[PDB]
Amino acid sequence: MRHYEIVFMVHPDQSEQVPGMIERYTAAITGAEGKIHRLEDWGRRQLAYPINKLHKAHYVLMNVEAPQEVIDELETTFRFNDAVIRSMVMRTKHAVTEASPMVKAKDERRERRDDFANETADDAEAGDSEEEEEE
Amino acid sequence: ARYFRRRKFCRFTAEGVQEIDYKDIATLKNYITESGKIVPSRITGTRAKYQRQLARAIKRARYLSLLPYTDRHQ
Amino acid sequence: PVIKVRENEPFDVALRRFKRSCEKAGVLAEVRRREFYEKPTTERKRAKASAVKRHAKKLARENARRTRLY
Amino acid sequence: AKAPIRARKRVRKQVSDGVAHIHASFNNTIVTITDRQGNALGWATAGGSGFRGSRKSTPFAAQVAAERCADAVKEYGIKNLEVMVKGPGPGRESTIRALNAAGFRITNITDVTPIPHNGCRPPKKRRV
């Protein structure tokens, strides 16, 4: 099998309803003798054009070992979902060995790389736990 | 004596052979200005192979909506 | 036009040296022209080329200055 | 009540603060003071000061646009500005100098010219 990496997006209203998605995707990869090496949240990002009449949306990142056809299959699942509103999937990628790696990139998102339309607190109920003494 | 004080991706052959990766958008922030421009090799602290590889990852993250790309946003 | 600044209302400090968006600015390189593989270094050698009496006079000043024989 | 004063003792708003937005254009300069939410309160121009394209495009015409715009907002009780500028035109500091010299207090000057990631094909002047 292959090391993979997955990005996918949901609305801001769904940024604390994304762990319920990550449960199913995890269970697809663990079902396949694959393992989750990292799970991470990139938070709310600002959009050049409204999707379904709203200017912002929520990004998440997973980092895995999985068979490549699982991540073929999962890139297609995002692309067939209307709640999952855009993805990118990329071949031959792995997690960091670091704990809480993502907190420093959450910090970058809330500062210069959104337009901060929505509270930090709902988007942070996704992905990597912000253990600030590990990072 | 042996060994001497290396520079970023220096004194070795088997580092920065393959690309410097985009997922660390917090590290990528280091290599952009306050107008979302790329900084060249002499500023990232790296040589030609590694800067070409940085500039692909920097590009990637900004057009993925993960890294700053101007002083402005909407 | 004005860039961004730590300054207290700069308008009485005659800055122009960085104070552009396009006007002698770096983004003027693809704005309003063709691609030109040769031009942008050719046009340096050409611009310099005609003022040769004034060029040669500074060169001659420096050769006469440099020798400590006066 | 006495008979009223020869010049006003009072002024109907006192919002203190605003932004002078300048569009220093390739043929003109336009100055507008707006409240902090961007609703414009009054404006004035280079070109309306008796100048065509050929003279309205200068920092001296722009210098005068700033004075007529400082007068345009007098009743809204603003005195404190920050400044935002866009467009290729030279109406970008002589304007500010005469803006501050028409009884306002400037504290910041910032650019708001939009710059692209390559973008679309540019407009043409002198077939350039």
Curated annotation (Swiss-Prot), chain A:
Among InterPro entries, the record links this protein to:
Ribosomal_bS6, Ribosomal_bS6_CS, Ribosomal_bS6_sf, Ribosomal_S6_plastid/chlpt, Transl_elong_EF1B/ribsomal_bS6
Enumerate composition-biased segments (Basic and acidic residues): 104-116
Q: What does this protein do?
A: Binds together with bS18 to 16S ribosomal RNA.
What are the Acidic residues biased-composition ranges?
120-135
Q: Which organism is it from?
A: Escherichia coli (strain K12)
Cellular component aspect of the GO annotation:
cytoplasm; cytosol; cytosolic small ribosomal subunit
Query: Which family is this sequence assigned to?
Result: Belongs to the bacterial ribosomal protein bS6 family.
Where is the organism placed in the taxonomic lineage, from the top? Bacteria, Pseudomonadati, Pseudomonadota, Gammaproteobacteria, Enterobacterales
Q: Residues bearing N6-acetyllysine? A: K93
Name it. Small ribosomal subunit protein bS6
What Pfam family does this protein match (any one)? Answer: Ribosomal_S6
Instruction: Supply the alphabetized keyword list.
Output: Acetylation, Ribonucleoprotein, Ribosomal protein, RNA-binding, rRNA-binding
Curated annotation (Swiss-Prot), chain B:
Q: Name one GO biological process term.
A: cytoplasmic translation
List, alphabetically, the Pfam families matched: Ribosomal_S18 (PF01084)
Q: Does the keyword ATP-binding apply?
A: no
Q: Provide a GO CC annotation, any one.
A: cytoplasm
UniProt cross-references to SUPFAM superfamilies, sorted A to Z: Ribosomal protein S18
What domain of life is recorded for the organism?
A: Bacteria
Modification N-acetylalanine, positions: A1
Q: Which family does it belong to?
A: Belongs to the bacterial ribosomal protein bS18 family.
- From the Swiss-Prot or TrEMBL record, give the protein name: Small ribosomal subunit protein bS18
Q: What is the protein's species of origin? A: Escherichia coli (strain K12)
Swiss-Prot record, chain C:
Region span, Disordered: 42-70
HAMAP family in the record: Ribosomal_bS21
Biased composition regions of type Basic residues, renumbered to the chain: 45-58
What the entry lists under InterPro entries is as follows:
Ribosomal_bS21, Ribosomal_bS21_CS, Ribosomal_bS21_sf
Q: Which domain of life is it from?
A: Bacteria
Extract one GO BP annotation from the record: cytoplasmic translation
Give the gene name. Answer: rpsU
Write out the GO MF terms: rRNA binding; structural constituent of ribosome
Instruction: Describe the subunit structure.
Output: Part of the 30S ribosomal subunit. In stalled ribosomes contacts ribosome rescue factor SmrB.
Question: Keywords in UniProt for this one?
Answer: Ribonucleoprotein, Ribosomal protein, RNA-binding, rRNA-binding
- Task performed by this protein: Probbly involved in recognition of ribosome rescue factor SmrB in stalled/collided disomes; fusion of protein fragments to its N-terminus decreases ribosome rescue in the presence of SmrB.
Family, similarity comment: Belongs to the bacterial ribosomal protein bS21 family.
Basic and acidic residues composition bias: residue spans: 59-70
PROSITE patterns cross-referenced by the UniProt entry: RIBOSOMAL_S21
Under the heading NCBIfam families, the entry gives: S21p (TIGR00030)
A GO cellular component annotated for this chain's UniProt record is:
cytosolic small ribosomal subunit
**Name of the protein in its database record:** Small ribosomal subunit protein bS21
Curated annotation (Swiss-Prot), chain D:
In its UniProt record, a GO molecular function of this protein is: structural constituent of ribosome
Q: Which UniProt keywords apply?
A: Methylation, Ribonucleoprotein, Ribosomal protein, RNA-binding, rRNA-binding
Among Pfam families, the record links this protein to: Ribosomal_S11 (PF00411)
UniProt xrefs under SUPFAM superfamilies: Translational machinery components
Query: Which HAMAP family would you find in this protein's record?
Result: Ribosomal_uS11
Summarize the protein's role: Located on the platform of the 30S subunit, it bridges several disparate RNA helices of the 16S rRNA. Forms part of the Shine-Dalgarno cleft in the 70S ribosome.
**What else is noted?**
Has been predicted to contact the N-terminal domain of IF-3 based on footprint studies; exactly how IF-3 interacts with the 30S subunit is controversial.
Q: What protein name is recorded for this chain?
A: Small ribosomal subunit protein uS11
Whose protein is this, by species?
A: Escherichia coli (strain K12)
